[PDB]
Amino acid sequence: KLSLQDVAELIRARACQRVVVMVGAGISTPSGIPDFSPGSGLYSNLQQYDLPYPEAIFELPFFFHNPKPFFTLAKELYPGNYKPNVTHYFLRLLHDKGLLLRLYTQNIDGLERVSGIPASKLVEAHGTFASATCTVCQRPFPGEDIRADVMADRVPRCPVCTGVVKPDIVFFGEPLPQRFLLHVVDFPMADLLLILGTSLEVEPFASLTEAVRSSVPRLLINRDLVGPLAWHPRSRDVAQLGDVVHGVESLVELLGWTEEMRDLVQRETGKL
Ligand SMILES: CCCCc1oc2ccccc2c1C(=O)c1cc(I)c(OCCN(CC)CC)c(I)c1
Numbered sequence: 001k002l003s004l005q006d007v008a009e010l011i012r013a014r015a016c017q018r019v020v021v022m023v024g025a026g027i028s029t030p031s032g033i034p035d036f037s038p039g040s041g042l043y044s045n046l047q048q049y050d051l052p053y054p055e056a057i058f059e060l061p062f063f064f065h066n067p068k069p070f071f072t073l074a075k076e077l078y079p080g081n082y083k084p085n086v087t088h089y090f091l092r093l094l095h096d097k098g099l100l101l102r103l104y105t106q107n108i109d110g111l112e113r114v115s116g117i118p119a120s121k122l123v124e125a126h127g128t129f130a131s132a133t134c135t136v137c138q139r140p141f142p143g144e145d146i147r148a149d150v151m152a153d154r155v156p157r158c159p160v161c162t163g164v165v166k167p168d169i170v171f172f173g174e175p176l177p178q179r180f181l182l183h184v185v186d187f188p189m190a191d192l193l194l195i196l197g198t199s200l201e202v203e204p205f206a207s208l209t210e211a212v213r214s215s216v217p218r219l220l221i222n223r224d225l226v227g228p229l230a231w232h233p234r235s236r237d238v239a240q241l242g243d244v245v246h247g248v249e250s251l252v253e254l255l256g257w258t259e260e261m262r263d264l265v266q267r268e269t270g271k272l
């Protein structure tokens with residue numbers, strides 16, 4: 001049975017070169033973002049100035065009745081406000097070394113892109129602020145195109161039809177984005193599965209943990225060994241439990257990437 005050190009050695013040797021990564025809230029709580037709660041600036045602004053129940057912010061009928069609470073969230077989360085942490089920059093290094101096949105994220109914070117991972121390596125399964133769509137005519141827009149409006153508290157409008165333009169966040173009851181169907185080709189192709197800051201207990205992600213081939217190691221860096229990896233373990237599974245930040249930092253040191261990480265972060269926080 002494999003250790004965290006064993007997985008790092010596979011990566012160093014390039015024996016695993018087609019890494020599929022699945023990430024959740026656990027990697028973004030350290031940047032200061034909540035899992036999608038009294039006491040924060042955000043909550044003082046929405047959950048008090050005007051939401052009726054927390055979930056309404058992600059419901060379409062509410063949205064069309066009153067888009068302001070949702071846009072308060074967009075303004076708080078739009079790229080630039082929060083910083084990627086070591087977990088995101090680990091995945092950035094993985095990509096820059098040619099080892100990342102795809103990163104599947106449950107998060108909407110956008111920090112994978114802010115860390116510099118290109119859109120084509122990402123599957124933002126719960127959607128993104130990086131793009132937006134007219135709710136009436138379906139015209140797509142880059143997220144930059146509505147940024148002035150979002151930062152100024154204006155509800156963005158389509159210049160063709162004047163419909164409300166909504167960031168491409170997945171709302172209750174909507175289908176997952178089309179890119180999610182990359183799983184069909186990605187999972188068979190993976191030669192390593194890394195799962196960070198979630199246990200993927202909820203479908204369709206749960207089932208995806210079993211879509212890699214039987215010889216593929218699955219590394220869970222998560223608070224606990226729970227979920228599908230716990231219910232149906234495989235002989236090449238590895239669990240690094242406790243703090244996901246320490247976990248990643250540990251893996252980065254075993255990889256020998258600690259100094260390169262320090263240089264990346266210093267360049268990157270220079271530019272932001
Ligand atoms: C088909 C999967 C939908 C994914 C999804 O769309 C959302 C829209 C707004 C807010 C959240 C989501 C969201 C999820 O994050 C999500 C979806 C489901 I369905 C979901 O199910 C709850 C699981 N449930 C049964 C075990 C409680 C244990 C959970 I938790 C999160």
Ligand SMILES: [Zn+2]
Nearest residue numbers: 134137158161
């Ligand atoms: Zn339109």
